[PDB]
Amino acid sequence: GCCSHPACNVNNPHICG
DSSP, rough: TTTTTTTHHHHHHHHOO
């Protein structure tokens, strides 16, 4: 998964973070 990474939560903030 990508939503389990702080950096991936930056580019995907409200959808993935």
